[PDB]
Amino acid sequence: ATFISVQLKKTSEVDLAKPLVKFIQQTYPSGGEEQAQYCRAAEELSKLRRAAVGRPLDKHEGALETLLRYYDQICSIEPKFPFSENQICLTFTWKDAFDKGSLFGGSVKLALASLGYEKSCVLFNCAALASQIAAEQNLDNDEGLKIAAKHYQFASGAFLHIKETVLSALSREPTVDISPDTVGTLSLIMLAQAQEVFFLKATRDKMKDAIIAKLANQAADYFGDAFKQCQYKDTLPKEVFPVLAAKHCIMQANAEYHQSILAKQQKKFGEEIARLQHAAELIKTVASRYDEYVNVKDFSDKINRALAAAKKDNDFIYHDRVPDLKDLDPIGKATLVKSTPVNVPISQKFTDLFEKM
Amino acid sequence: DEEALKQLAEWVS
């Protein structure tokens, strides 16, 4: 099991309170109590940021819920505070999640006086953590499976949301890690991995070989498309392209392997052999191009066991004609997976610190 | 065959 996850973007500390407190004492002549509490709620928000984006990596629902709360909050402050009028005086500075920058200098960083920029990088890190937690799961466990599937789908919908909104909200030119191309590709990757998780669920629940094959076939479409978005690009870490190329072939081999079990059941012995030969070729390709990144050895043995047994009996008993691949029906596609929409609130039991404002 | 498919869709729910 080799899953892709995304590193969180780094940020630097900001005093959210100082510039927010000072811009609350406006309309609101109440230099007394009520108005001067909405200014300690802005202390809670500044502390919340330090919590969401400042603490050393924690990989629990603990740390993700913090992040998602922080995102929820930032979004409900945008009507409260003048920022695409701006107006207020906050600068958020974030490093690019991927571009190391030249060691002939420093990071690739981008400072902007924008709530838009802030929420985008926050959402990014919500997606990235979600992907880390999904990739962490023990997939030999039904609840591990379920947490991976839920989180890959969240991460997919949240990268996609950034794709539709980064440019609108930034005004300026985004950094390449959050730009629509990188992030549309990360969305498709998480969604591929979500599908792969359903394939593994079905494997585990020993479902109908026909079901499993369509689930694997659709995964191969998703992984196919993601590697093709990466073919001419060097934005993501270097392990990403070869993993996606490998998975695209592994997924196709799983499709053919399970479709072969169905053919056999149906006494279509020639078709079984044809599909198994396709599987073995795919898996032979991956074993020789991509061995630094996946271990395909037990699958390969399993295919070779089935193909050796298949050929021996067809030659000695059935004499079925082994058909050509272009003459076989296509394996269908079952998609069980979508990009979770970002609809605030995204956090568990949210309350806006500035609700009655 | 989309019967066992709904009973997969509604697991992650």
**What CATH number does the domain containing A17 carry?**
1.25.40.280
Q: Nominal resolution in Å?
A: 2.2
The strand pairing partners of A110, in sequence order, are: A94
3-state secondary structure of B5: helix
Residue that has been written with the tokens 């169905």 in this structure: A262
Q: Do B12 and A153 touch (CB under 8 A)?
A: yes
How far apart are alpha carbons A276 and A300 in whole angstroms?
A: 10
Q: Which has the closest alpha carbon to A61: A142, A140, A154?
A: A154
Query: Which residues in chain A are contacts of B10 at CB distance < 8 A?
Result: none
Q: Which has the closest alpha carbon to A153: B5, B3, B12?
A: B12
Q: Do B4 and A150 touch (CB under 8 A)?
A: no
Whether the CB-CB separation of A331 and A255 falls below 8 Å is answered with yes
Amino acid at A217: N
3-state secondary structure of B12: coil
Q: What is the largest CA-CA distance in chain A?
A: 96
Q: Do B9 and A146 touch (CB under 8 A)?
A: no
Whether the CB-CB separation of A277 and A285 falls below 8 Å is answered with no
**Percent of chain B that is helix, strand, coil (3-state, to 5):** 55, 0, 45
The strand pairing partners of A304, in sequence order, are: none
Whether the CB-CB separation of A208 and A252 falls below 8 Å is answered with no
How far apart are alpha carbons A115 and A21 in whole angstroms?
A: 16
Range of the structural domain that residue A346 is part of: 1-357
Give me the sign of the Cα torsion angle A245, A247, A253, A255: negative
How far apart are alpha carbons A200 and A142 in whole angstroms?
A: 10
- In chain B, the residue whose alpha carbon lies closest to the alpha carbon of A145 is B12
Query: Which residues in chain A are contacts of B8 at CB distance < 8 A?
Result: 198, 201-202, 336
Whether the CB-CB separation of A195 and A201 falls below 8 Å is answered with no
Q: How was this structure determined?
A: X-ray
How far apart are alpha carbons A58 and A52 in whole angstroms?
A: 10
Report how far apart, in Å, the C-alpha atoms of A216 and of each of A2, A223, A248, A278 are: 16, 10, 9, 15
The strand pairing partners of A11, in sequence order, are: A94
Whether the CB-CB separation of A323 and A271 falls below 8 Å is answered with yes
Query: Which residues in chain B are contacts of A208 at CB distance < 8 A?
Result: 1, 4
How far apart are alpha carbons A3 and A134 in whole angstroms?
A: 9
Query: Which residues in chain A are contacts of B9 at CB distance < 8 A?
Result: 336
How far apart are alpha carbons A15 and A4 in whole angstroms?
A: 34
Q: Distance from A149 to chain B by nearest Cα, in Å? A: 7
What DSSP designation does B7 have?
H
Report how far apart, in Å, the C-alpha atoms of A166 and of each of A45, A56, A72, A182, A232 are: 23, 26, 17, 12, 23
Q: Do B1 and A208 touch (CB under 8 A)?
A: yes
Number of structural domains in chain A: 1
Q: Which has the closest alpha carbon to A161: A135, A195, A130?
A: A130
How far apart are alpha carbons A13 and A18 in whole angstroms?
A: 13
Residue A345, preceding bond cis, omega within 30 degrees? yes
Instruction: Say how far residue A194 (Cα) sits from the centre of its chain.
Output: 8
How far apart are alpha carbons A163 and A165 in whole angstroms?
A: 6
Q: Do B1 and A210 touch (CB under 8 A)?
A: yes
Whether the CB-CB separation of A152 and A134 falls below 8 Å is answered with yes
How far apart are alpha carbons A145 and A166 in whole angstroms?
A: 31
Q: Which has the closest alpha carbon to A20: A2, A35, A32, A4?
A: A35
Interface check A130 vs B, CB under 8 A: no
Q: At A294, list the tokens.
A: 């996946």
Q: Distance from B8 to chain A by nearest Cα, in Å? A: 8
Whether the CB-CB separation of A162 and A206 falls below 8 Å is answered with no
In the 3-class helix/strand/coil scheme, how is chain A assigned residue by residue?
Answer: CCCCCCCCCCECCCCCHHHHHCCCCCCCCCCCCCCCCCCCHHHHHHHHHHHHHHCCCCCCHHHHHHHHHHHHHHHCCCCCCCCCCCCCCCCEEEECCCCCCCCCCCCCEEEECCHHHHHHHHHHHHHHHHHHHHCCCCCCCHHHHHHHHHHHHHHHHHHHHHHHHHHHHHCCCCCCCCCHHHHHHHHHHHHHHHHHHHHHHHHHCCCCHHHHHHHHHHHHHHHHHHHHHHCCCCCCCCCHHHHHHHHHHHHHHHHHHHHHHHHHHCCCHHHHHHHHHHHHHHHHHHHHHCCCCCCCHHHHHHHHHHHHHHHHHHHHHHCCCCCCHHHCCCCCCCCCCCCCCCCCCCCCCCCCCCCCC
How far apart are alpha carbons A312 and A77 in whole angstroms?
A: 71
Whether the CB-CB separation of A166 and A179 falls below 8 Å is answered with yes
How far apart are alpha carbons A24 and A4 in whole angstroms?
A: 44
Query: Which residues in chain A are contacts of B3 at CB distance < 8 A?
Result: none
Instruction: Name A166's Cβ contacts closer than 8 Å, sequence gap at least 6.
Output: A120, A174, A178, A179, A180, A183
Report how far apart, in Å, the C-alpha atoms of A140 and of each of A202, A258, A263 are: 12, 20, 28
